């Protein structure tokens, strides 16, 4: 599914609104990218499907802290 493994961002629903205010249902998808993250503690690459936002979280917190959070949830990688 289109779910960020770091943040849990997923598709949300809302409306397209025309100039005449016609509402049609749409989705907003996360900006997801499969990315190979270097885990220097483990000396290997871990691939995560992450939002661009999730990538900024990894930059801020570090991959070790993030993977520990994933292990606590039971999110496997």
């Amino acid at each position: 599914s289109r779910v960020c493994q770091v943040t849990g961002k997923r598709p949300v629903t809302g409306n397209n609104r025309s100039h005449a205010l016609n509402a049609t249902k749409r989705r907003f998808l996360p900006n997801l990218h499969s990315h190979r993250f270097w885990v220097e503690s483990e000396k290997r690459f871990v691939t995560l499907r992450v939002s661009a936002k999730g990538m900024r979280v990894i930059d801020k917190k570090g991959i070790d802290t993030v993977l520990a959070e994933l292990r606590a949830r039971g999110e496997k990688y």
Partner: protein, 41 residues
């Protein structure tokens, strides 16, 4: 992104130099090849 250089990196600086790099340069090259580390403290 602020990093601390560990190896001498060309067009950047020397060991212990605080430098701002593009996040992609740090994430995909400097950090995985052990040339810099994130400026954590």
């Amino acid at each position: 992104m602020q990093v601390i250089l560990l190896d001498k990196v060309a067009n950047l600086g020397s060991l212990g130099d605080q430098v701002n790099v593009k996040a992609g340069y740090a994430r995909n090259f400097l950090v995985p090849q052990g040339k810099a580390v994130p400026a954590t403290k």
